[PDB]
């Protein structure tokens, strides 16, 4: 009796199953930025209140990439002299973390899926260049003495979904570099997070641990070019 | 006991039944463009990165038409000399595919419903003009030697929901030509898709197969005039 | 066993109960206009393609009013000479239908609730001025020989939520006249709808019967001043 | 049998549990303002129709603060001469109510949570300065003879999420003062609400009791700088 | 000797003769409004600080009409009920002054030239409707008992170059009624000016006598649609 | 004595000589459109009130071209089907008039100077295609039976300085075809002007003879992309 | 002979006499701000690079007032706490300099003409409040011990033509306080200028002496509401 | 007789002397860009049609600087990697030409005046780095083997009045580097100009010699931030 009716109740709930699953957001975040397209002018400007005069930093982010090219920028900090200060991006299947210069990069192979949220986070300290990438909370890659003894200066432009090219011409950003998908939980810290801290940054009810420099839901992140807040 | 309570549980879930059903999206697409009204200025501009110098193409699309007139444009590619290069549209009850010139068209009669999503897709190769229309994955119509030996040139304007008229006067598009409804999953390929490929393009978890020329969620599709992204 | 866990399943579904109920829309309409506030500049312009040279008309509408004043305009058609051609509005508790002139009005007392959708609809034919108001499908009021032998001319401005005052000064509309709430299913017909037609216009799956003059989801309705499309 | 199936039914409903919980709104409010970030230009201007020439007032509000600093403004009324006429704000953990002057403040310690809605409401009468703060319906703090014999004049600017600084320079608001979170049910009364009235203002189906001076869903509350209506 | 070189000096000054003559402005006026075209939406809004609750008024204007149709509006004040309260316009060759309603008007035949500045001033007192038109300082046409015992109420919209038709439709102003040319010295008084005052208003150094209700260079005149301030 | 001081008077007037000469305008025209650069999106839309359903037409224009390429468009009228209905342009040194189609055209060799105003007027009647080009009032080149028995239809877009390419893509107009310089006195007639009328149109005090279809200072000309009205 | 022709040469030059006189600018200034009207929202923001933490200051300005009311503001610097820090304004016929607060002010009677440029410069040093007003280079009125021992703090907003009221309400500036006319040569110094320097600031070729804090043609002055640069 | 009246004629012409002198433009240039202030965001973008893949180039510009700081940029071309490719700027009194990098530069001491137009042209060929600076047509300073064997690549942004800092942050350009004054005749050539050509570029009727890469009145120059075209 009850089982038979439960059959049709489940059949009905199937309609809302996918509708709720498609708009699900990771952690406890109630807002995210949507890049519906790889444009020549789509990006998001971040305006940290605290200066970026940082020697050690651990930048985490929740990403869901619809299409990943040879080079797709998640977030990137770049000054006038050197546009590749901090730059997390995605290759065809790997994740690349660039600190200091374009030549100093750390690559973690084949642990990013397209339509699934992943907590990509990258740590780096200037004492000996001990850089690491954690994906979904477990170590993905690590290297030492890369960009060692380097300090990212102030005045640089930090963006999400693009690299420093400027939009004083009505865009001008390289389309192939753009990011198309969803971003949330963008946090940057002034110190190397501990292992447990990195694990708990990408948990279930974890969208309330925000960095001091850039904090999701606190810092001025304004999208441009077509990106929008999908609350 | 449990059955009685299940009665009221189902009665309660009835309230969310329609609310979830009305905003349901086809395939796995999490975003779509809404044309709430037939205006003189409503359309959506598409900006393919790859040039449209194509001899064979298979253009798929998910459409839900609120009202269909004698001539309602779903998508249309048109150059300066000939505005009817590629044009998929809807008659009162039939679906029309135009390639090359307005005289060359293929008509499939009475398989489009108003308030229901349908995966209209049109294939065409210039070797002998073998054109086809598949609706919901099964062949709807086919013809041979139409617009044969024709090449759609570059520089043309591609739009969704309207035809090439231009909006340098504050609109100017013919209202009767406009489209009012919902569009999603707009993909254009550079080659004739195989039968299984066409079948799987309009499946359940099928909103991740995108064309190389125009790909939903990848290409710059910007609405104008009142059209908007209903995420 | 099953009953006990069903208790907590219902407790869980309670959280989504109200969230789905609050954004529920009447009929089968998937889109509506939200007037969040009574501003000096909030309204919605309607642009019928067919001229308003009508002798008989039946104008239906779905309304949910957050706050109703001495005079709150739902929709209003007004020419340059006479701004009170057609005007449906709400008094403190009654519904008023004005056709032809401000002196010719029909009042139906105390059948409008604030936070609940109601299908207010008004019919009028110029042969003898036989005007009627139906609320939720059942007759609310009726009168004869009011504005008889009158023809509403063309060129008039039709708005939803305000009356004809113009916004060439940055607003100027009377705040007290404004409408704050939700509107959907705005339809105007060129003929007096039959009783069954009026009953089925405000049904359950009834948001696909649209008028020839103004049709919800077909005609150009553009909000202004703060009103927005709440899909 | 039924129990086993109910196990996976609950497992499935878990996906929509959090999705519905994250966008839940308090009382019966169907609309709210979202401050996604602490910008230099984010706020919301309120335009009461009735003048603020009030001697006694009870200002209620529903707030959900993502991050609370040393000084975070929920709402603030300020004239040209004295910008601190009325100002409700949040310290690190306490709630502060300022009436008349910045020196006259009432502080209620440690009853505000970050990610949870709370019905903060403040009452004040000028007969003897008997001011009170109610949090979630129960008394949080109270004092007497503070700003006694004072009248808040007219012409002042009332904002939500910021204090009176002006935005004729492209912002200029102090970032640290800004509010980042969600606001709803902003009501201001011309008289001291009774205890039962304050209790029922922050109830379950209580988002229909609105003040005469400022009423949520009635008064012109236009956000600026990045604040949004999250319907 | 000197006489011979004077010929070349005059020939040189010839190049600046016309260039200075074309941009010459009448009276001592240093600024004027240019209506380059008869757009569908060209006009200028006037926002008098003092209310238009006037019984007797004198209104002057310096006009240079590039093209005059059957009906070309210089300025027009109109309320919601009656859009033809005050309206000065030009027929093919005559000047028409309308006060109260279209039925009662004053016409002065054939004293307006196209490319030449003319100082048109219409006066009217409600005691007996004694209305007069003065062109370039000399009386043109006078009538008595027209719109007698009439009072132009407040709230009406006053414009230059168009009638009261509203621009909430993206224009909508009748193209034919538009004004294309140059306007300056728009003044409206609360009392019928004396003959000597009328003569002095249209003098040489006379762009410093301005009306109390509307005063050129003091009142808020906002051009729209293509009209611009030609300083 | 007088001659000596006249020397310095002439020396002084030298400073204003060039300043007045550079901003000189031809005919009695007091306004003109300036195309400072050959932008990708610079043009001017023209919106004739009278439809372009014309069989015979004479079109004049005063032009001062800063730089003339292989193809520089002064004005161009083009429909959706055929964008080359009417098109007057400049080759490296010649003036080209196109009516009907690109195949049939009239060319007048080497009578256009760059920095000097020239009055180019092309006439054409459909009775036998008798087309003529008049430069500065004297006939330049005439031909017969070109585009004979052809009628330019309605709906076509008419622009100055560009072709019909549409700006819904944020521009897209071919840069090379653009016009950079100054334009004025754009007039189009519904009949072939007589020889004396053609001479008078390009006279000294001749900026008051305007066409019925398009008339300078009467028709609606909207510059776009960087073009502006240089009064 | 020469004298006779010189008569007509002078008659010719008469046409350009007034045209050049009306647009004349004082000093060697090549640009100025025009306030065509006393709008509700007309002003000009000034953004000094150097902070206003000044104890002694001299502030000059060239002013030409079309209409002067009971209180018309030339420039005004005001902080959040005290909006009347520095404020130079005009009464019906006198010039008023306000430093520190409203109570302490300096008044110079009847030396301002409406349509004539005047060089008003107010100096003030905090050692003993020795404040002075210089009009056209000759001292107008001086006082001692007014606002003595006072320091104007930083963060205050400095405007020309209005007070500190804010425009986040779409204006809100008091209309009466507005300034309508022309302004130029706005300079503010960090030290009390010497008498010879004061005289030289208002000379003939004197639009190249600019203050260190605010300098005309160097400091960032943005007109708003209708004000514009009349070059 | 004639001499006496000529005295007053000269006295009258004195009034227009300065008014014509202040708006005088050099060469035969009829248009120029005005930088009224040193805003945080004032500049002008230049969009050369021909790519900047140049080995030898000569770049001229007419400049009139109101205020010159330690570093004031006239024009600057900079790529992403190296923002200092080409950069002409002014020190306190000298003119500096930078090609390749900041380390290698050419300085010409003390030949720039503030309020006077000067024709600064820098030439450089990569064969041996033979760079030269010509001021007003006479060589100022030359050097050899500086940036030798260097090629300025494509994609770099070229601006007038600022460096390459990007305006995606709502400005961000360094205020000190900005340029405040007037610019015209901006030309860049693909080959080192000859000495006679250099002299002719800065002549009297010399505003018709324009470069192939960037040509004044041909290339797309868009002012931003407050800069405007002073025709
Ligand atoms: C992938 O991108 C890198 C730079 O990010 C590039 O060096 C490499 O060649 C690319 N792989 C290709 C093009 O196959
Ligand atoms: C339907 O549209 C076609 C063109 O798309 C037209 O030829 C045909 O006449 C229309 N049918 C009608 C008007 O009944
Ligand atoms: C209600 O409104 C009507 C006009 O719509 C007005 O005549 C009447 O006086 C109002 N009732 C009041 C003010 O009590
Ligand atoms: C908290 O803010 C108050 C003012 O609102 C301030 O006086 C106090 O010092 C702050 N507490 C700190 C800075 O620890
Ligand atoms: C001129 O205009 C008036 C109304 O302004 C109109 O009545 C009259 O017919 C017009 N004259 C014509 C059309 O010849
Ligand atoms: C000049 O332009 C025409 C088309 O307008 C073109 O056919 C011709 O080749 C051009 N001349 C050249 C490129 O030398
Ligand atoms: C002039 O203005 C002052 C304040 O600026 C005011 O106190 C005074 O009353 C005014 N004079 C009048 C209103 O006659
Ligand atoms: C002038 O500017 C240069 C850089 O352009 C700088 O190195 C130098 O120190 C400056 N001179 C000063 C600050 O006196």
Distances (CA, A) of D223 to A29, D42, H116: 22, 8, 48
Residues of A in contact with B217 (CB under 8 A): 36-37, 66-67, 180
Domain spanning F28-230, CATH architecture: Sandwich (2.60)
Q: Mutate which of F69, F71, F105 to test ligand 6's pocket (most atoms within 8 Å of Cβ)?
A: F71
Q: Where are the beta strands (DSSP E) in chain H?
A: 32-35, 43-47, 56-67, 72-78, 86-90, 95-99, 105-108, 118-125, 130-135, 138-143, 157-160, 180-189, 220-224, 228-230
Around Cβ E7, how many Cβ atoms within 10 Å?
10
Query: Which of B159, B155, B147 has the alpha carbon at shortest distance from B79?
Result: B155
* Contacting partners of chain D (3+ CB pairs under 8 A): A, C, G
**Tokens 């009311």 label which residue?**
G69
Atom number in ligand 1 closest to CA A70: 1
C70 CA to centre of ligand 3 in angstroms:
6
Long-range contacts formed by G146-150: CB under 8 A, 24+ apart? G146/G99, G146/G100, G146/G104, G146/G105, G146/G106, G147/G99, G147/G100, G147/G101, G147/G104, G150/G99, G150/G100, G150/G126
- Which residues make Cβ contacts (< 8 Å) with residue C9, sequence separation at least 6? B9, D6, D9, D10, D13
Query: Which of A131, A119, A140, A134 has the alpha carbon at shortest distance from A186?
Result: A119
Around Cβ E173, how many Cβ atoms within 10 Å?
26
Query: Which of C46, C78, C51, C54 has the alpha carbon at shortest distance from C156?
Result: C78
Q: How is the beta sheet containing E32-35 ordered, strand by strand?
A: E138-143, E130-135, E118-125, E56-67, E180-189, E32-35, E228-230
Give the nearest partner residue to H19 out of G2, G24, G221, using CB atoms.
G24
Q: How far apart are CA F76 and CA F62, in angstroms?
A: 15
**Residue H43 near residue H162, CB atoms below 8 Å:** yes
CATH number of the domain at E32-230, out of 3.40.640.10, 3.40.50.300, 1.20.1270.10, 2.60.120.200? 2.60.120.200
Around Cβ H178, how many Cβ atoms within 10 Å?
28
**Residue A87 near residue A95, CB atoms below 8 Å:** no
For A4-40, b where at least 16 C-beta lie within 10 A, e where not — what string?
A: ebbeebeebbeebbbbbebbebbbbbbbbbbbbbbbb
**Residue B178 near residue B70, CB atoms below 8 Å:** no
Query: Which H or E element spans position E66?
Result: strand E56-67
**Residue E41 near residue E173, CB atoms below 8 Å:** yes
Q: How far apart are CA E155 and CA E83, in angstroms?
A: 11
Q: Which two tokens stand for residue D159?
A: 């904002």
Indicate the burial class of G68 (C-beta count within 10 angstroms; 0-12, 13-18, 19 or more).
buried
Nearest 10 degrees: Cα torsion G71, G75, G77, G78: 30
Q: How far apart are CA C180 and CA C167, in angstroms?
A: 18
Pocket residues for ligand 6 (CB within 6 Å)? Answer: F 70-71, 91
Backbone angles phi, psi at F199, to 5 degrees: -65, -45
**Residue F202 near residue F82, CB atoms below 8 Å:** no
- Of all protein residues, the one whose alpha carbon is nearest to atom 1 of ligand 6 is F70
Backbone angles phi, psi at B56, to 5 degrees: -125, 140
CATH 2.60.120.200 fits A27-229, yes or no: yes
Enter the resolution in angstroms: 3.3
Three-state SS for G90-152 is: ECCCCEEEEECCCCCEEEECCCCCCCCCEEEEEEEECCCCEEEEEECCEEEEEECCCCCCCCE
Half-sphere exposure (CA, 13 Å, Cβ side) for H132?
A: 16
Pocket residues for ligand 1 (CB within 6 Å)? Answer: A 70-71, 91
Distances (CA, A) of A199 to A56, A58, C60: 18, 12, 57
In angstroms and rounded to an integer, the radius of gyration of the C-alpha atoms of chain A is 19
**Tokens 């009205």 label which residue?**
F229
Query: Which H or E element spans position C7?
Result: helix C2-22
Question: Does the distance separating the beta carbons of H169 and A166 come in below 8 Å?
Answer: no
Query: Which of G198, G59, G55, G73 has the alpha carbon at shortest distance from G139?
Result: G198
Q: Mutate which of C68, C69, C71, C178 to test ligand 3's pocket (most atoms within 8 Å of Cβ)?
A: C71
Please give the full DSSP string across B114-137, using - where no structure is assigned.
SSS-EEEEEEEETTTTEEEEEETT
DSSP state of A158: E
Name the residue of chain G whose CA is nearest to E204's CA: G18
What's the count of helices (H) and strands (E) in chain H, helices before strands? 2, 14
Atom number in ligand 8 closest to CA H71: 5
Q: How far apart are CA B68 and CA F68, in angstroms?
A: 48
- Residue D107 CA to chain centroid, in angstroms? 15
**Residue D186 near residue D208, CB atoms below 8 Å:** no
Domain spanning H25-230, CATH architecture: Sandwich (2.60)
Report H helices in chain A: 2-22, 195-201
Residues of C in contact with D208 (CB under 8 A): 66, 114-115
**Residue E132 near residue E157, CB atoms below 8 Å:** no
Residues of B in contact with C222 (CB under 8 A): 37, 226
Q: Which residues pair with C87 in a beta bridge?
A: C76, C98
Q: How far apart are CA H129 and CA F153, in angstroms?
A: 61
Name the residue of chain G whose CA is nearest to H12's CA: G17
Query: Which H or E element spans position E187?
Result: strand E180-189
Give the three-class secondary structure for E18. helix
Indicate the burial class of F150 (C-beta count within 10 angstroms; 0-12, 13-18, 19 or more).
middle
- Of all protein residues, the one whose alpha carbon is nearest to atom 1 of ligand 4 is D70
| Degrees, nearest 5: CA angle A115-A117-A121 | 135
Give the three-class secondary structure for A4. helix
Q: Which two tokens stand for residue A66?
A: 């619809």
- Of all protein residues, the one whose alpha carbon is nearest to atom 13 of ligand 3 is C70
Q: How far apart are CA G224 and CA G216, in angstroms?
A: 17
DSSP state of B214: B
- Which residues make Cβ contacts (< 8 Å) with residue F217, sequence separation at least 6? E36, E37, E66, E67, E180, E181, F31, F207, F210
Q: How far apart are CA B144 and CA G22, in angstroms?
A: 77
Q: Which residues pair with G96 in a beta bridge?
A: G89, G107
**Residue B125 near residue B192, CB atoms below 8 Å:** yes
Nearest 10 degrees: Cα torsion E189, E193, E197, E200: 50
Distances (CA, A) of F134 to F68, F76, F97, G24: 19, 18, 11, 42
Q: How far apart are CA A112 and CA H105, in angstroms?
A: 48
Distances (CA, A) of F88 to D86, E45, F169: 68, 38, 25
Q: Which two tokens stand for residue E81?
A: 């009920």
Q: Which two tokens stand for residue F130?
A: 């008798």
Give the three-class secondary structure for H199. helix
- Per CATH, the number for G25-229 is 2.60.120.200
Q: How far apart are CA F30 and CA F33, in angstroms?
A: 11
Distances (CA, A) of D176 to D102, D106, D161, F45: 17, 21, 11, 49
**Tokens 């309603």 label which residue?**
E101
Q: Where are the beta strands (DSSP E) in chain B?
A: 33-35, 43-47, 56-67, 72-78, 86-90, 95-99, 105-108, 118-125, 130-135, 138-143, 157-160, 180-189, 220-224, 228-229
Q: Which two tokens stand for residue E17?
A: 């003769």
Q: Residue C111 region, left (φ>0) first, then alpha (ψ -120 to 50), else beta? A: alpha
Q: How far apart are CA B222 and CA G114, in angstroms?
A: 54
Q: Which two tokens stand for residue A211?
A: 């960095």
Backbone angles phi, psi at B77, to 5 degrees: -110, 125
| Degrees, nearest 5: CA angle E210-E176-F49 | 135
**Residue D44 near residue D225, CB atoms below 8 Å:** no
Give the three-class secondary structure for B62. strand
Distances (CA, A) of D23 to A24, C116, D19, D231: 11, 22, 7, 9
Looking only at the bridges linking them, the beta strands covering D72-78 and D86-90 are antiparallel
Atom number in ligand 5 closest to CA E96: 5
Please give the full DSSP string across chain F, using - where no structure is assigned.
-HHHHHHHHHHHHHHHHHHHHHT--STT---EEEE-S--TT-EEEEE-SS---BSEEEEEEEEEES---SSEEEEEEE-SS-TTSEEEEE-SS-EEEEES-SSSEEEE-S---SSS-EEEEEEEETTTTEEEEEETTEEEEEESSSSTT--B-SS-EEEESS-S--STTS----TTT---EEEEEEEE-SSPPPHHHHHHHTSSS-TT---SSB-TTTSEEEEETT-EEE-
**Residue C46 near residue C61, CB atoms below 8 Å:** no
Q: Which fold has domain D28-229?
A: Jelly Rolls (2.60.120)
Distances (CA, A) of G128 to D101, G121, G124, G146: 31, 19, 9, 8
Q: Which residues pair with G152 in a beta bridge?
A: G54
Q: Where are the beta strands (DSSP E) in chain G?
A: 33-35, 43-47, 56-67, 72-78, 86-90, 95-99, 105-108, 118-125, 130-135, 138-143, 157-160, 180-188, 220-224, 228-229
Q: How far apart are CA B9 and CA B104, in angstroms?
A: 56
Backbone angles phi, psi at A6, to 5 degrees: -60, -35
- Which residues make Cβ contacts (< 8 Å) with residue E97, sequence separation at least 6? E87, E88, E105, E106, E122, E124, E131, E133
- Residue H21 CA to chain centroid, in angstroms? 21
- Which residues make Cβ contacts (< 8 Å) with residue A67, sequence separation at least 6? A38, A114, A180, A181, B210, B215, B217, B218
Name the residue of chain E whose CA is nearest to G4's CA: E3
Distances (CA, A) of F157 to D120, F40, F153: 60, 18, 11
* Chain B interface mutation, best of A1, A8, A16, highest count of B Cβ atoms under 10 Å: A16
Question: Does the distance separating the beta carbons of B9 and A6 come in below 8 Å?
Answer: no
Q: How far apart are CA H87 and CA H120, in angstroms?
A: 13
């Amino acid at each position: 009796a009850v089982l038979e009716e439960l059959r049709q109740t489940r059949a009905d709930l199937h309609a809302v199953q996918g509708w709720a699953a498609r708009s699900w957001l990771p952690a406890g975040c109630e807002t995210a930025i949507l890049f519906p397209m790889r444009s020549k002018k789509i990006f998001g400007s971040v305006h940290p209140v605290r200066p970026m005069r940082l020697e050690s930093f651990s930048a985490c982010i929740w990403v869901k990439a619809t299409d990943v090219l040879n080079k797709t920028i998640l977030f990137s900090y770049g000054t006038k002299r050197n546009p590749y200060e901090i730059q997390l991006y995605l290759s065809y299947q790997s994740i690349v973390f660039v600190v200091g210069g374009e030549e100093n990069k750390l690559v973690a192979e084949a642990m990013v899926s397209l339509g699934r949220w992943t907590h990509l986070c990258g740590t780096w300290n200037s004492e000996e260049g001990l850089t690491s990438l954690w994906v979904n909370g477990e170590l993905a890659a690590t290297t030492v003495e890369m960009a060692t003894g380097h300090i990212v200066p102030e005045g640089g432009i930090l963006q999400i979904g693009q690299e420093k090219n400027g939009c004083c011409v009505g865009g001008g950003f390289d389309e192939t570099l753009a990011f198309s998908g969803r971003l949330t939980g963008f946090n940057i810290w002034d110190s190397v997070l501990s292992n447990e801290e990195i694990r708990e940054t990408g948990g279930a009810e974890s969208c309330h641990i925000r960095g001091n420099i850039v904090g999701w839901g606190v810092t001025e992140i304004q999208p441009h070019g077509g990106a929008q807040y999908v609350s």
